[PDB]
Amino acid sequence: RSKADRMAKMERRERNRHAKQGESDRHNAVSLSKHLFSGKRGVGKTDFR
Amino acid sequence: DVVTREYTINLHKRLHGVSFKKRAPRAVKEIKKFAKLHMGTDDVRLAPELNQAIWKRGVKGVEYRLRLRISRKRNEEEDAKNPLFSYVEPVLVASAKGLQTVVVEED
Amino acid sequence: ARYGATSTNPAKSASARGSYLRVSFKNTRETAQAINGWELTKAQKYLEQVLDHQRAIPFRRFNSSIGRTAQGKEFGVTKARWPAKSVKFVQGLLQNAAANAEAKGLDATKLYVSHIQVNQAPKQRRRTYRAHGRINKYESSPSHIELVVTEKEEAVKKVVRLTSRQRGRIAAQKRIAA
Amino acid sequence: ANLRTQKRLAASVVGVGKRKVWLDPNETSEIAQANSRNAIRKLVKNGTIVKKAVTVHSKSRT
RNA sequence: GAAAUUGUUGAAAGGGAAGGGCAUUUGAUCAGACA
RNA sequence: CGUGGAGGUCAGUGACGAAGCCUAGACCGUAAGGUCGGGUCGAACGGCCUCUAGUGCAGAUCUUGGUGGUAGUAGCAAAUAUUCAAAUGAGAACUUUGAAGACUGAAGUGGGGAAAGGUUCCACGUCAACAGCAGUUGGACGUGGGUUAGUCGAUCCUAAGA
RNA sequence: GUGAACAGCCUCUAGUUGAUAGAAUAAUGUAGAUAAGGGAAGUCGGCAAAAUAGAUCCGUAACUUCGGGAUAAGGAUUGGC
Helix, strand or coil, X not given: CHHHHHHHHHCCHHXXXXXXXXXXXXXXXXXXXXXXXXXXXXXXXXXXX | CCCEEEEEEECCCCCCCCCHHHCHHHXXXXXXXXXXXXXXXXXXXXXXXXXXXXXXXXXXXXXXXXXXXXXXXXXXXXXCCCCEEEEEEECCCCCCCCCCCCEECCC | CCCCCCCCCCCXXXXXXXXXXXXXXXXXXXXXXXXXXXXXHHHHHHHHHHCCCCCCEECCCXXXXXXXXXXXXXXXXXXXXXXXXXXXXXXXXHHHHHHHHHHHCCCCCCEEEEEEEEEECCCCCCEEECHHHXXXXXXXXXXXXXXXXXXXXXCCCCCCCCCXXXXXXXXXXXXXXX | CCCHHHHHHHHHHXXXXXXXXXXXXXXXXXXXXXXXXXXXXXXXXXXXXXXXCCCCCCCCCC
């Protein structure tokens, strides 16, 4: 069991460095979001406040 | 050196121009500093009966003069302070004026 | 094993490490260079006084826009600060290295910190939220600590060529001078 | 110890809200052993948990 | 287990940038060679 | 001159250390580059005569991944507010109990429900991560327990409509 | 409870005490105020702020599709026992 319980701690490390709050946090970061960078904003109605 | 004394304390000159939501929490931090002055200790204990006496008129109606009793006592082993600590408890009196400091005798 | 480059005797030297310690790195660089090279018994009481706002840690490198205080006149720097959470780990390692020296059987009074070294660990990756739905990082900088204590040691013929003309000059003056 | 259970649980037995029930600090070991409603009836009536009767709202000036 | 980047030790320089070219001093350092 | 593979050749070098990497140590070529020593490492790789091509990068607001300066800085300031002792603990501004002080003030910070979520509900254990401070606590993590219908609903009927 | 009232303010039953904190009170801020004499001279412009306000009684113009205009304007008064 202590052989098996230490293998839970060995396999947990990679998710802790990425600050995953579980073994079930698989929220994926989009590399480049479309609304941030694709636009040209001139006189008129604009894309935000 | 166990010595129990009486004291008056002028809280009006210590709470001059203090924000109304921070008067009664500040008057508590004065007595821990005020018992540090006379007895020369850091760990100062306030009785729950004294906490009622400060806070009785809300946060913003702390009394002008209080009449305290500061008792210095021996402290227990494996405490990291030093073997002495104070203990501040209130004595209930008619008027806080007209009183000066008095050594309470021991028995 | 595999510390930094050390020039000392490994016979009379204990050591201690700390891996993946979740402190700030910029605070633990400075509270390691304040202590580097002191006597061991003087270093521990100093760190006991840093907690009580009696003596401050000087910040030399990571020190932009730090407020001033008067307690850095001892070291000659206006900028100083009292990083408390960094001291509570670093003096925890001095208690270890003092305990490691008693197992080897070294003196307590002669011992001094000779090497202390702190460098960056793998960073946390935590995220926070900003205006316009933008996602920027919000991360830590943990650090590895290692230190080595050492006893103090109470201590601190080249053949020369010359020409035949210069060989005569010494021989002539030795003949003349009484 | 942690006593959020028995504070909540004695409120259900006596039938009064959580702001009213009184758990004395001297019996901090005796109350923590009780983990059922059936023990709470015994702990109430021998005088460890009491009621704290109603705050006055007088109507004399009215 | 390379580079960016960082720590510690050691050497060196520093009056509003640094780095480069030609020549030599200074300190450190290094192979060749007479039998 | 250099790189990846091919046909030859040196009966080429190699676990007594092959490639790779580091090296203000040495030599050669005007140069692309070639050779040697030292440190690391552990298993295959060269010279020459030719053959072949997914063959050489500093730039393309280049592509994927990684790291800095700025910087321990901007900041963590709406919703009136917290205080003292005791227990628990290696540890308490933040957990639990008691004593105080206030607030929401019946178009509520209260008591239930429809969409919607799917075990969050409760107990026992327990803190590496998350809770932008902290943590002994949690809507976290680990293991289990828990929704009972002749009458409450669906099921039946029809509306605009399919 | 006050009041025309489910307004605003305070309280009882019920619930919460959560929103990073400690010390000092420089400038400039954001939010909220008061100001001698004069009263829009300020300014694109009375922007903003001040003034008036609930209630009973007296009183109400030009005009008008005769219904309105109208709370027009303006003027006296308000506690306690």
